[PDB]
Ligand binder design. Structure first.
Ligand SMILES: OCc1cc(-c2cccs2)on1
Ligand SMILES: OCc1cc(-c2cccs2)on1
Ligand SMILES: [Cl-]
Ligand SMILES: [Cl-]
Ligand code: NA
Ligand code: NA
Ligand code: NA
Ligand code: NA
Lengths: 407, 407
């Protein structure tokens, strides 16, 4: 198998519109969560969200937007950033050896709802002719593949909150086995009431912190009460090692492990044992210690705990376990985007020699008192190997491990 | 690389509710297309569809339906059929070596729209707590993985009309490279106005045959005027060869080629050159002649022709080219389900020694007069190798090649 490295990154997040802004937010534990007035107007329990703050029309031209929903527009921006970061030529973007696996946990629900509404109000013609590529589940891959003239692999994986972890892992495999030499991998999610309501109706999102939105997402806090939804996008450029070296690429890290398993248990709640198998599969090809864990931890009563038990099973407790810091306490949960964004956060922490605080822990849940959950930012630390989990509804598990390239 | 075989099949189609009914429909060129009264009531131009005729509540129990949209309910039925056909034990379904890649071109648009509507009419709580798994893009994998207790790989690929071809091809790869020994692969699509309208608004669906619905889908006919939408599902059980042989499996065929490429050209129209590269990639590992082509051909003016040119480029024209018969003339276009359904039709034709008519060609388009488009069913033919194309919006291409197992 060939070795595979990350040569460029792009991101649109609730905690920044590029990697520099995201880094600053991570350093400073600056929350991306705000009040969602619209949710209040619609009668939601949860009235908080993690909204990007970015001017799409300034960054994606009108014709380029014809087939974009908002989530895939953010993904286009992230793609542009990743291409610029990697320093790719047009030929390097568009060739038979270069593909795309780019996903979202859902398509544009707003397109779907607006189309249904206008059909009934004004007639089917008024849907217009450009809705399918926005509404289809492959929207993120189809739009970017077309616009960037991708010639190799082109499809989307979805797996709920595991989506963009699986996108990256499958892209990794493609390169490992010699089918492609370069891949754009990642994903996105729109932020829209028509999606958020589905989660509010299940009681899954935080509602006890509406009056202090910035602290509503609080993985590992005793009084956590559900996740905070977000939107955004991320892209990694992946290359086989020889390709990267020969062109003088930047190497943000090497992908050294990938796990993908299934709980076969409950639709909404994790089993724990599936996560253990997933992490072990990712670690089976890793020779170095893990220096930092970016957990799935979404700030839910039922979710944060089984993953901690899985981590304890593999790594132990206390100082011998890698430091754990839940970035979702700052960012919220961006669904399809979360895996790739967490890969980016982890790689940026590796680049900058720090581990962020696991934010908003006002009182640690005593169930986790034995674990090295990061209570204050750790500075001047050399991270060489980082692990990130993402687990999704339907019992779907994905883990990635990235390593600092030293030969 | 390991060899990979198809050991079980299941299907819910506009042309039958199981493989026996589908076979009879193929033999007899019995159309699955009917009038869609609802489309007329809503003011659509297109008033035809390919609707399954199956009693879901008789085949999937109530608790089992909690997280199903209609499309994934059909997929559950197809999964049950495939498991029964393969003769698998519960242990063979549920183990770490057995996974699922199961997709849909979209999720349940009806869930999404009904939820938006009820939110505004009666409030967010009235969405109920079970909508997310229906509405998410990974619905087909999540629901089946959970219910069937799948422990290995679990995710969905989507790629518009290529969806379930890519699902099968990626599952094939998983087995080839030794990551899994058995996979359930395929996909589904609901049939619902909230999806169909998106295509009617683009002018993509047939509207000149509303008064003779059965003949509206007519690939290669001079007067074709757009596709006919359908819903349904299909599943293949795939196994590495040694696994299959050791358990006394039925072997419907061996997967011997898989192509996946990207046009990087237009969102809706194919380029042709991408299809050529895709077919060549599938054929690069195939040593025998192709005996039958199951084309993408959807009965569109702009789609049927570039694929025929791609076929001419690779195979030639006239008698030296494999016979071509477009099953979509009988079935319509079931979107996410179409790739796996066409694999099943092709395998059933192989099993039964016939090639179906390419139906509803009242006047062949003179542009295709040089090609071996099947005008009348061909009987008593031994098919050994069959090729099936599926191409999707966003320039996404997938081709599969299946071969009769003879050692
Ligand atoms: O298509 C709408 C939709 C999207 C999702 C999810 C995204 C990530 C986890 S579930 O759920 N419903
Ligand atoms: O999510 C709704 C939807 C589904 C699709 C497509 C399915 C297959 C090709 S496009 O387009 N919109
Ligand atoms: Cl369940
Ligand atoms: Cl275009
Ligand atoms: Na190891
Ligand atoms: Na993570
Ligand atoms: Na060949
Ligand atoms: Na086909």
């Amino acid at each position: 198998m060939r070795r595979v490295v990350v040569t460029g990154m792009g991101i649109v997040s609730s905690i920044g519109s590029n990697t520099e802004e995201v880094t600053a937010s991570l350093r400073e534990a600056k929350s991306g969560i705000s009040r969602a007035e619209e949710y209040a107007e619609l009668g939601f329990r949860c009235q908080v969200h993690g909204a990007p703050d970015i001017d799409i029309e300034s960054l994606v031209d009108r014709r380029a937007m014809r087939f974009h929903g908002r989530g895939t527009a953010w993904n286009h921006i992230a793609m542009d950033q990743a291409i610029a970061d990697a320093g790719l030529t047009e030929e390097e973007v568009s060739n038979e050896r270069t593909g795309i696996i780019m996903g979202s946990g859902g398509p544009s629900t707003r397109t779907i709802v607006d189309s249904a509404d206008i059909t009934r109000e004004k007639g089917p013609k008024r849907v217009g002719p450009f809705a399918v590529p926005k509404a289809m589940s492959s929207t993120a891959s189809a739009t970017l593949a077309t616009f960037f003239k991708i010639k190799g692999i082109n499809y989307s994986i979805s797996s709920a909150c595991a989506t963009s972890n699986h996108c990256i892992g499958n892209a990794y495999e493609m390169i490992q086995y010699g089918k492609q030499d370069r891949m754009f991998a990642g994903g996105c999610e729109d932020l829209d009431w028509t999606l958020s309501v589905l989660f509010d109706a299940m009681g899954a999102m935080s509602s006890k912190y509406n009056d202090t939105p910035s602290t509503a997402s609080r993985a590992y806090d005793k009084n956590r009460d559900g996740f905070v939804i977000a939107g955004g996008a991320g892209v990694l450029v992946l290359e086989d090692l020889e390709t990267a070296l020969a062109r003088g690429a930047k190497i943000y890290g090497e992908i050294v492990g990938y796990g993908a398993t299934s709980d076969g248990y409950d639709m909404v709640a994790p089993s724990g044992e599936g996560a253990i198998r997933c992490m072990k599969m990712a670690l089976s090809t890793v020779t170095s210690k893990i220096d930092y864990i970016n957990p799935h931890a979404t700030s839910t009563p039922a979710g944060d705990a089984p993953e901690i038990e899985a981590i304890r099973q593999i790594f132990g407790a206390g100082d011998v376990c890698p430091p754990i810091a839940a970035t979702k306490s700052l960012t919220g949960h961006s669904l399809g985007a979360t895996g790739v964004q967490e890969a980016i956060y982890s790689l940026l922490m590796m680049q900058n020699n720090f581990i962020c605080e696991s934010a908003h822990i006002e009182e640690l849940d005593p169930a986790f008192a034995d674990m090295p959950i990061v209570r204050k930012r750790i500075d001047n630390v050399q991270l060489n190997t980082v692990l990130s989990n993402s687990f999704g509804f339907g019992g779907t598990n994905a883990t990635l491990v990235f390593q600092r390239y030293q030969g």
